[PDB]
């Protein structure tokens, strides 16, 4: 209710809004690379599964 | 219109002109001190305002 208090509130809000958030692009790239890894491993397993019914890999 | 009445008039005028007026120097000093007080408070508010755009007081 005092013009000093509101100015201090504005200053503290400006201080708090400048917090450095963590990097997110690399964080998501981690998940993307893990997805690629899992896909490759599952593809290897599926290919070796196919090599059981017949005696040759695809093509 | 009588020399007695005019003398009484002079006496009453002399009586009325001797009235003790209130002290005025202190009365004006009150306003001066209030002005100093308000100026100091406004200076504090302005300094805290400046401390919002930047993160340091002047100088």
From TrEMBL, chains A, B:
Membrane-crossing segments per the record: 2-25
Keyword Ribosomal protein part of the UniProt annotation: no
Keywords from the named record: Membrane, Methylation, Transmembrane, Transmembrane helix
Membrane topology listed for this record: Single-pass membrane protein
GO cellular component, one term: membrane
Annotated GO biological process: protein secretion by the type II secretion system
Signal peptide: none
Protein name: Geopilin domain 1 protein
InterPro entries given in the database record: Bac_GSPG_pilin (IPR000983), N_methyl_site (IPR012902), Pilin-like (IPR045584)
Main location: membrane
Location of the protein in the cell: Membrane
